[PDB]
Amino acid sequence: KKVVLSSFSIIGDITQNIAKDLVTVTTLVEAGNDSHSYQVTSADAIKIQNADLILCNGLHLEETYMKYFTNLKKGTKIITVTDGINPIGVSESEPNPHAWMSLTNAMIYIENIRKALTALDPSNAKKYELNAREYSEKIRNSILPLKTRIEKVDPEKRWFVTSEGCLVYLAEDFGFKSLYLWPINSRSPSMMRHAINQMRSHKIKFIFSESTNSDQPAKQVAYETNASYGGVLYVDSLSKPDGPAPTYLDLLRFSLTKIVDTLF
Ligand SMILES: [Mn+2]
């Protein structure tokens, strides 16, 4: 039985839905850990040695631990599952990694993983094909009605404002503008000042924080802007199993529900 190592929880869960136990799916950066300076352990090096295929996000998500994907099993490829996604920068240059926060992109993650699994394990091609379509449809069925509702928001109110720049791909997929306090979790006073200024200028009503960062900056910004704190979104990791976002589909569904419930 082949072993497919995903870099972090979101990719692991996508892969499990496509492979359904035809392969063993493992995860390096488990739910509740963050990729930036994640410390690869000895046990983790075992996962790496066992992998027949390594599935990474790219867009620099793994940059701090790519060096551990070395001395690999012969034949084992590293696949970037965001291939085909036009990157969105962190400036007016380095890429923002959060490409999974998008309905269009979910379909691209699935397709690239389907393709890689099929190349690895061609005897099960018909199964990966069916599974990939089923899962793509399940995501569409859950998430499209939330998009449809979001799209009714009056143009002046088409802003996604968060703490980390975690929704920039969602904004591009749905046709919203994004404002945030820092591009990636690991914090700048000028970026806070800008968001405050932009919220006042555009009468922006809500700002969110996220499940792996502090709510204090968002709350402070809300106070300074006479905006409201929108609460916590799940974006960078799956939740614990009894939390609200234990799968990728549940993560998209929770965060988009919370956004649409806010913005109406
Ligand atoms: Mn992040």
Short mmCIF file of C-alpha atoms and ligand atoms in Angstrom, two decimals:
data_model
loop_
_atom_site.label_atom_id
_atom_site.label_comp_id
_atom_site.label_asym_id
_atom_site.label_seq_id
_atom_site.Cartn_x
_atom_site.Cartn_y
_atom_site.Cartn_z
CA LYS A 1 0.00 0.00 0.00
CA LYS A 2 1.33 3.35 -1.09
CA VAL A 3 1.84 6.20 1.38
CA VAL A 4 1.06 9.83 0.42
CA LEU A 5 2.37 12.54 2.81
CA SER A 6 0.52 15.91 2.80
CA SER A 7 2.32 18.98 4.19
CA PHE A 8 -0.59 20.09 6.40
CA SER A 9 -4.06 19.22 7.56
CA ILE A 10 -6.07 20.83 4.82
CA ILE A 11 -4.22 18.98 2.06
CA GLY A 12 -4.35 15.74 4.01
CA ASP A 13 -8.11 15.94 4.29
CA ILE A 14 -8.57 16.75 0.57
CA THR A 15 -6.37 13.81 -0.31
CA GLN A 16 -8.30 11.44 1.96
CA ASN A 17 -11.49 12.34 0.16
CA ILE A 18 -9.98 11.54 -3.23
CA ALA A 19 -8.11 8.39 -2.24
CA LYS A 20 -10.61 6.89 0.24
CA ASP A 21 -8.17 4.39 1.70
CA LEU A 22 -6.66 3.24 -1.61
CA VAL A 23 -3.48 4.78 -0.20
CA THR A 24 -2.37 5.66 3.30
CA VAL A 25 -2.66 9.42 3.73
CA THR A 26 -0.35 11.01 6.32
CA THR A 27 0.12 14.64 7.36
CA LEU A 28 3.22 16.49 8.47
CA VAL A 29 1.91 19.71 10.08
CA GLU A 30 -1.04 18.32 11.94
CA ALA A 31 -4.10 20.41 12.82
CA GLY A 32 -3.28 23.07 15.43
CA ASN A 33 0.34 23.56 14.33
CA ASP A 34 1.45 26.25 11.94
CA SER A 35 3.84 25.77 9.00
CA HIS A 36 5.95 28.84 9.69
CA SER A 37 8.99 27.47 11.62
CA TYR A 38 7.13 24.12 12.35
CA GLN A 39 9.78 21.92 13.89
CA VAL A 40 10.07 18.63 11.92
CA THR A 41 10.61 15.90 14.55
CA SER A 42 12.40 12.55 14.32
CA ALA A 43 9.01 10.86 13.99
CA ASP A 44 8.21 13.22 11.23
CA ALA A 45 11.38 12.17 9.39
CA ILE A 46 9.89 8.63 9.41
CA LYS A 47 6.77 9.94 7.70
CA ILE A 48 9.02 11.55 5.13
CA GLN A 49 11.00 8.35 4.46
CA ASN A 50 7.79 6.32 4.12
CA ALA A 51 6.20 8.68 1.60
CA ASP A 52 5.80 7.47 -1.97
CA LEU A 53 4.47 10.97 -2.90
CA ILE A 54 4.72 14.30 -1.04
CA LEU A 55 1.93 16.84 -1.57
CA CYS A 56 2.85 20.48 -0.77
CA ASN A 57 0.90 23.71 -1.03
CA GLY A 58 3.72 25.70 -2.48
CA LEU A 59 3.31 29.48 -2.55
CA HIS A 60 6.11 29.32 0.03
CA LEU A 61 3.88 27.73 2.72
CA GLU A 62 6.57 25.12 3.33
CA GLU A 63 9.60 27.31 2.86
CA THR A 64 10.98 26.81 6.37
CA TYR A 65 10.83 22.98 6.24
CA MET A 66 11.39 22.15 2.55
CA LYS A 67 14.97 21.25 3.57
CA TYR A 68 13.63 18.19 5.45
CA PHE A 69 12.21 16.76 2.19
CA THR A 70 15.54 15.28 1.36
CA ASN A 71 17.20 11.79 1.33
CA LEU A 72 13.82 10.65 -0.05
CA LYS A 73 12.69 7.24 -1.19
CA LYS A 74 13.67 6.62 -4.85
CA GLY A 75 10.85 7.66 -7.12
CA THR A 76 9.17 9.88 -4.56
CA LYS A 77 8.11 13.18 -6.10
CA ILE A 78 7.13 16.46 -4.41
CA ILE A 79 3.92 17.78 -6.05
CA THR A 80 2.77 21.40 -5.67
CA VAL A 81 -0.97 21.20 -5.49
CA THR A 82 -1.51 24.90 -6.32
CA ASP A 83 -0.06 24.51 -9.86
CA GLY A 84 -2.34 26.57 -12.15
CA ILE A 85 -3.33 29.11 -9.49
CA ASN A 86 -2.17 32.63 -10.30
CA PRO A 87 -0.41 33.86 -7.17
CA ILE A 88 -1.49 36.88 -5.21
CA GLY A 89 1.42 38.77 -3.70
CA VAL A 90 1.92 39.95 -0.16
CA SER A 91 2.84 43.50 -1.38
CA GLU A 92 2.54 45.85 -4.37
CA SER A 93 6.22 40.20 -4.29
CA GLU A 94 6.43 37.00 -2.16
CA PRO A 95 3.26 34.95 -2.66
CA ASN A 96 0.35 34.80 -0.24
CA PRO A 97 -0.13 31.08 0.42
CA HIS A 98 -3.84 30.95 1.29
CA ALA A 99 -5.06 29.76 -2.14
CA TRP A 100 -7.35 27.13 -0.59
CA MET A 101 -9.82 29.80 0.60
CA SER A 102 -11.66 29.82 -2.71
CA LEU A 103 -14.33 27.74 -4.41
CA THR A 104 -12.57 27.83 -7.79
CA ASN A 105 -9.31 26.87 -6.20
CA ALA A 106 -10.73 23.99 -4.20
CA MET A 107 -11.48 22.41 -7.61
CA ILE A 108 -7.83 22.97 -8.71
CA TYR A 109 -6.43 21.44 -5.45
CA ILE A 110 -8.65 18.40 -6.05
CA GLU A 111 -7.67 18.08 -9.75
CA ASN A 112 -3.94 18.33 -9.07
CA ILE A 113 -4.20 15.76 -6.27
CA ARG A 114 -6.33 13.42 -8.45
CA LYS A 115 -3.71 13.71 -11.19
CA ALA A 116 -0.83 12.97 -8.84
CA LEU A 117 -2.55 9.99 -7.21
CA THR A 118 -3.37 8.60 -10.64
CA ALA A 119 0.26 8.91 -11.80
CA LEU A 120 1.42 7.24 -8.60
CA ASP A 121 -1.20 4.46 -8.67
CA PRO A 122 -2.53 4.07 -12.19
CA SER A 123 -4.30 0.82 -11.56
CA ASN A 124 -6.87 2.74 -9.47
CA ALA A 125 -7.32 5.61 -11.98
CA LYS A 126 -11.08 4.96 -12.39
CA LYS A 127 -11.57 5.17 -8.65
CA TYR A 128 -9.61 8.40 -8.21
CA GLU A 129 -11.61 9.81 -11.17
CA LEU A 130 -14.96 8.99 -9.60
CA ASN A 131 -13.89 10.07 -6.13
CA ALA A 132 -12.51 13.39 -7.33
CA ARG A 133 -15.79 14.22 -9.15
CA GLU A 134 -17.91 13.21 -6.14
CA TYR A 135 -15.85 15.30 -3.80
CA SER A 136 -15.74 18.34 -6.14
CA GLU A 137 -19.56 18.14 -6.31
CA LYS A 138 -19.92 17.84 -2.56
CA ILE A 139 -17.85 21.02 -2.14
CA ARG A 140 -19.83 22.84 -4.82
CA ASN A 141 -23.13 21.77 -3.31
CA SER A 142 -22.20 23.11 0.11
CA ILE A 143 -20.33 26.20 -0.82
CA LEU A 144 -22.09 27.55 -3.88
CA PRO A 145 -25.23 28.55 -2.05
CA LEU A 146 -23.09 30.67 0.32
CA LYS A 147 -21.45 32.39 -2.71
CA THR A 148 -24.83 33.00 -4.25
CA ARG A 149 -25.97 34.70 -1.08
CA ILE A 150 -22.64 36.70 -0.66
CA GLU A 151 -23.00 38.00 -4.19
CA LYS A 152 -26.17 39.93 -3.24
CA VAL A 153 -24.13 42.27 -0.98
CA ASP A 154 -24.35 45.91 -2.10
CA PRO A 155 -21.10 47.00 -3.82
CA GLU A 156 -20.14 49.49 -1.12
CA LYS A 157 -20.11 46.61 1.35
CA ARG A 158 -17.95 44.23 -0.70
CA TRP A 159 -14.96 44.08 1.67
CA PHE A 160 -13.43 41.07 3.42
CA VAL A 161 -11.43 42.51 6.41
CA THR A 162 -9.37 40.13 8.47
CA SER A 163 -6.33 40.09 10.73
CA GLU A 164 -4.02 37.86 8.66
CA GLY A 165 -4.33 38.27 4.84
CA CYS A 166 -6.06 34.92 4.68
CA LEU A 167 -8.98 35.80 2.35
CA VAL A 168 -7.21 37.43 -0.58
CA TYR A 169 -7.98 34.44 -2.84
CA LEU A 170 -11.61 34.33 -1.68
CA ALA A 171 -11.89 38.05 -2.48
CA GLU A 172 -10.51 37.47 -6.01
CA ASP A 173 -12.84 34.44 -6.58
CA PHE A 174 -16.02 36.23 -5.43
CA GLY A 175 -15.22 39.79 -6.55
CA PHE A 176 -14.65 41.49 -3.18
CA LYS A 177 -11.90 43.80 -1.96
CA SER A 178 -9.69 42.57 1.02
CA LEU A 179 -8.05 44.56 3.82
CA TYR A 180 -5.93 43.01 6.54
CA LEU A 181 -3.45 43.77 9.33
CA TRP A 182 -0.54 41.43 8.31
CA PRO A 183 -0.06 39.20 5.21
CA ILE A 184 1.04 36.00 7.04
CA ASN A 185 1.01 34.99 10.76
CA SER A 186 4.48 35.00 12.42
CA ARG A 187 2.97 42.37 12.48
CA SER A 188 3.52 45.95 11.34
CA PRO A 189 2.21 49.25 12.69
CA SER A 190 1.88 50.92 9.23
CA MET A 191 -0.37 48.13 7.99
CA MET A 192 -2.65 48.62 10.99
CA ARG A 193 -2.79 52.38 10.43
CA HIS A 194 -3.72 51.75 6.76
CA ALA A 195 -6.53 49.37 7.59
CA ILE A 196 -7.94 51.79 10.08
CA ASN A 197 -7.82 54.55 7.52
CA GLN A 198 -9.37 52.36 4.82
CA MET A 199 -12.22 51.21 7.05
CA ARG A 200 -13.20 54.72 8.00
CA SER A 201 -12.88 55.92 4.43
CA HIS A 202 -15.11 53.08 3.11
CA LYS A 203 -17.37 52.79 6.16
CA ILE A 204 -16.40 49.15 6.61
CA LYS A 205 -18.57 47.47 9.22
CA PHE A 206 -16.73 44.29 10.33
CA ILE A 207 -13.28 42.89 10.96
CA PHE A 208 -12.50 39.22 11.77
CA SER A 209 -9.73 37.32 13.45
CA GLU A 210 -8.67 33.79 12.93
CA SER A 211 -8.44 30.56 14.92
CA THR A 212 -4.62 30.54 15.17
CA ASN A 213 -4.04 34.18 16.02
CA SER A 214 -5.00 36.73 18.62
CA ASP A 215 -8.27 38.63 18.51
CA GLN A 216 -6.78 41.67 20.19
CA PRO A 217 -5.61 43.51 17.08
CA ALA A 218 -8.97 43.10 15.32
CA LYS A 219 -10.81 44.25 18.37
CA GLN A 220 -8.59 47.27 18.74
CA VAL A 221 -9.09 48.15 15.04
CA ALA A 222 -12.86 47.78 15.41
CA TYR A 223 -12.81 50.22 18.29
CA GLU A 224 -10.68 52.79 16.39
CA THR A 225 -12.94 52.55 13.29
CA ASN A 226 -16.36 52.34 14.95
CA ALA A 227 -16.62 49.01 13.20
CA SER A 228 -17.63 45.70 14.87
CA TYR A 229 -15.53 42.70 15.61
CA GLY A 230 -16.90 39.89 13.38
CA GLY A 231 -15.46 37.00 15.44
CA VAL A 232 -13.20 34.04 14.58
CA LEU A 233 -12.72 32.39 11.19
CA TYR A 234 -11.00 29.03 10.50
CA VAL A 235 -8.45 29.44 7.69
CA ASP A 236 -4.90 28.15 8.47
CA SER A 237 -5.61 24.71 9.98
CA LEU A 238 -8.45 22.29 10.40
CA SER A 239 -9.96 22.48 13.86
CA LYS A 240 -9.71 19.71 16.42
CA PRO A 241 -12.14 16.83 15.60
CA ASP A 242 -14.93 18.19 17.93
CA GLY A 243 -14.38 21.79 16.72
CA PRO A 244 -16.39 23.34 13.88
CA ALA A 245 -13.93 22.82 11.02
CA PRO A 246 -12.57 19.23 11.25
CA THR A 247 -12.51 18.82 7.42
CA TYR A 248 -11.71 21.10 4.51
CA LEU A 249 -15.32 21.23 3.40
CA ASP A 250 -16.39 22.08 6.98
CA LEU A 251 -13.72 24.76 7.16
CA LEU A 252 -14.85 26.50 3.99
CA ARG A 253 -18.49 26.09 4.99
CA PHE A 254 -17.96 27.51 8.49
CA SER A 255 -15.88 30.49 7.49
CA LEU A 256 -17.99 31.46 4.51
CA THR A 257 -21.18 31.05 6.59
CA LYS A 258 -19.80 33.29 9.23
CA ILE A 259 -18.78 35.90 6.64
CA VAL A 260 -22.16 35.94 4.89
CA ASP A 261 -23.99 36.05 8.25
CA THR A 262 -21.95 39.06 9.17
CA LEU A 263 -22.23 40.98 5.96
CA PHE A 264 -25.93 40.64 6.00
MN MN B 1 -1.69 31.64 7.41
#
